């Protein structure tokens, strides 16, 4: 089960304000027009790889998706990140958890932290021992596919945890669909508007025109 991630999974790469400028950056982005795996929550939520970090997205009306689990074994041999979200609070823990074979939310912890119509986008990545989460919530009118438009994810938390990860799984309330695409090291040219919001991007390995735009540092090529 697949769809095409048009110009999705781009995020503010560093905590610096820039405006009216075209910045060429190299980071783990989701490639433009990549294949993204599109799961159904019923008939059921399988374990996925975490190859360089992921763009994860959900379409919802009632926020049934309420966490994620990450690690290399998920069976108390080693530390595992657990992120849970009851909409009133995010809760994050890194304990040596013994997970059930079917994880859900019912209706050695070296770190802890606390804080359809909706598309909720998240980018999860590891860099030098920091697990970074970028996020955005957006209104859409489409269950079947990702939207054909550009929107830029802004940092939600950076948590220093020092944990090795190769696998993950999303979890949901047990009394719907979600997308997974894998990040890759890419040069991108990012456009910042007069307000310093990034409003467009060019993936410098997509096609020879994007490689030309990125060579000239311009979104128009004469």
């Amino acid at each position: 089960a697949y769809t095409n991630s048009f110009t999705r999974g781009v995020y503010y790469p560093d905590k610096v304000f820039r405006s009216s400028v075209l910045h060429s950056t190299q980071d783990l982005f989701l490639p433009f027009f990549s294949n993204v795996t599109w799961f159904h929550a019923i008939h059921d939520n399988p374990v996925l790889p975490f190859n360089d970090g992921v763009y994860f997205a959900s379409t919802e009306k009632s926020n049934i998706i309420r966490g994620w689990i990450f690690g290399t074994t998920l069976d108390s041999k080693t530390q595992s990140l657990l992120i849970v979200n009851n909409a009133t609070n995010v809760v994050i823990k890194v304990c040596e958890f013994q997970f059930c074979n079917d994880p859900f939310l019912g209706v050695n912890c070296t770190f802890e932290y606390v804080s359809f119509k909706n598309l909720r986008e998240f980018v999860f990545k590891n860099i030098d021992g920091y697990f970074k989460i970028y996020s955005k919530h957006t209104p859409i009118n489409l269950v079947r596919d990702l939207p054909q438009g550009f929107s830029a994810l802004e940092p939600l938390v950076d948590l220093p945890i020092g944990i090795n990860i190769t696998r993950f799984q999303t979890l949901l309330a047990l009394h719907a669909a979600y997308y997974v695409g894998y990040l890759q090291p890419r040069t991108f040219l990012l456009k910042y508007n007069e307000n310093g919001t990034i409003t467009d991007a060019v993936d410098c390995a997509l096609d020879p025109l994007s490689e030309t735009k990125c060579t000239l540092k311009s979104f128009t090529v004469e």
């Binding site: 560093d14 905590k15 610096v16 304000f17 405006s19 009216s20 802004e154 940092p155 310093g196």
Partner: protein, 379 residues
């Protein structure tokens, strides 16, 4: 006679402005340096340190340390500094092996387990521990940069109290992280009041510089710490005590040019401070800069000394330097009409003169005799 660039002038900073985090917890270095046991170097401990004040003179003035080797910082500078996390790594080794813990050294420890980065910024602090850990004590034991690694591949040291590098040596490595993010660890430097609209020697979360700070109209997004512009120069910054965003403007500077008639004529001069308002410096303001000592005149004459932007200066009537908008020539309304012609009734023969360079000095420079000169050791 001419205009000579003699100097550069810069407005100097009036006072110094330090804005560090409003944090008062002292960092847990006591728990790193006074642990109940130290790890074996096969299984070295790592402690992150954050959201705290780090006094490093408490460490550096402690006469108990056998070394304090700092590789991208000097130990007396550490209280002037801000870092994202410190990362203290703690373990025990033989004293014969402390010298392996440097960025590019090699041996049975460093090439296998505790490899430092090729660009390590940090301090390695080490001391003997024979008075605490010798027994021998066959428990202290050894098996990519900063790798944890968990017949046998494992062997242990022979620490007895009669053993100098044959003794147990205890090491703490402080791996300071200077990335462009919230500097959660800073030195004990007391933060000062904010100053604005005036040239100052500022320092915000360790972002040292000099400039006129002014309140911005720019909307930073809540996760941003500072701002750039078209090139990678810092154009704005966020204060850590109150989250207002300040532009940085560089303190006013320019060339200084001395407008002079020849000393064969006079010793009186006028001074042009280029690209500045006179409020930053018998005074006049031109687009070229503030001009001091030349009188502005409503008349216009030929350009004797070219100042710029249509202004020129000259020495005239008992006499002074004058500055004026230059004159291009007399206004000649040609007496044209559809049936009028002017015909010259006489000529003049003028021998003009035109002077042209044609050649220049045929120098030849013997580069070995210039660069080295009579020396075989340099040749």
């Amino acid at each position: 006679k001419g205009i000579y660039q003699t100097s550069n002038f810069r407005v100097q900073p009036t006072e110094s402005i330090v804005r560090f985090p409003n944090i008062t917890n002292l960092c847990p270095f006591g728990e790193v340096f006074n642990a109940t046991r130290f790890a074996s170097v096969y299984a070295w401990n790592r402690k992150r340190i954050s959201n705290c004040v780090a006094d490093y003179s408490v460490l550096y003035n402690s006469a108990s340390f056998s070394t304090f080797k700092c590789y991208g910082v000097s130990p007396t500078k550490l209280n002037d500094l801000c870092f994202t996390n410190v990362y203290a790594d703690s373990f025990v080794i033989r004293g014969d092996e402390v010298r392996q813990i440097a960025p590019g050294q090699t041996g049975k420890i460093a090439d296998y387990n505790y490899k430092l980065p090729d660009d390590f910024t940090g301090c390695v602090i080490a001391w003997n521990s024979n008075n605490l850990d010798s027994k021998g004590n066959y428990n202290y034991l050894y098996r990519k940069p900063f790798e944890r690694d968990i017949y046998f591949p494992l062997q242990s040291y022979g620490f007895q109290p009669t053993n100098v590098g044959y003794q147990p040596y205890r090491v703490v490595v402080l791996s300071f992280e200077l990335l462009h993010a919230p500097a959660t660890v800073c030195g004990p430097k007391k933060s000062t009041n904010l100053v604005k609209n005036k040239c100052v020697n500022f320092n915000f979360n360790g972002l040292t510089g000099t400039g006129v700070l002014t309140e911005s109209n720019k909307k930073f997004l809540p996760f941003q710490q500072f701002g750039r512009d078209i090139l990678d120069i810092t154009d704005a910054v966020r204060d850590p005590q109150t989250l207002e965003i300040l532009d940085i403007t560089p303190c006013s500077f320019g060339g200084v040019s001395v407008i002079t008639p020849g000393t064969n004529t006079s010793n009186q001069v006028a001074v042009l401070y280029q690209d500045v308002n006179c409020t930053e410096v018998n005074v006049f303001q031109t687009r070229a800069g503030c001009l001091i000592g030349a009188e502005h005149v409503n008349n216009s004459y030929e350009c004797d000394i070219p100042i710029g932007a249509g202004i020129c200066a000259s020495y005239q009537t008992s006499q002074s330097i004058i500055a004026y908008t230059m004159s291009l020539g007399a206004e000649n309304s040609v007496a044209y009409s559809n049936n009028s012609i002017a015909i010259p009734t006489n000529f003049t023969i003028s021998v003009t003169t035109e002077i042209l360079p044609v050649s220049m000095t045929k120098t030849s420079v013997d580069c070995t005799m210039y660069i080295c000169g009579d020396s075989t050791e340099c040749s």
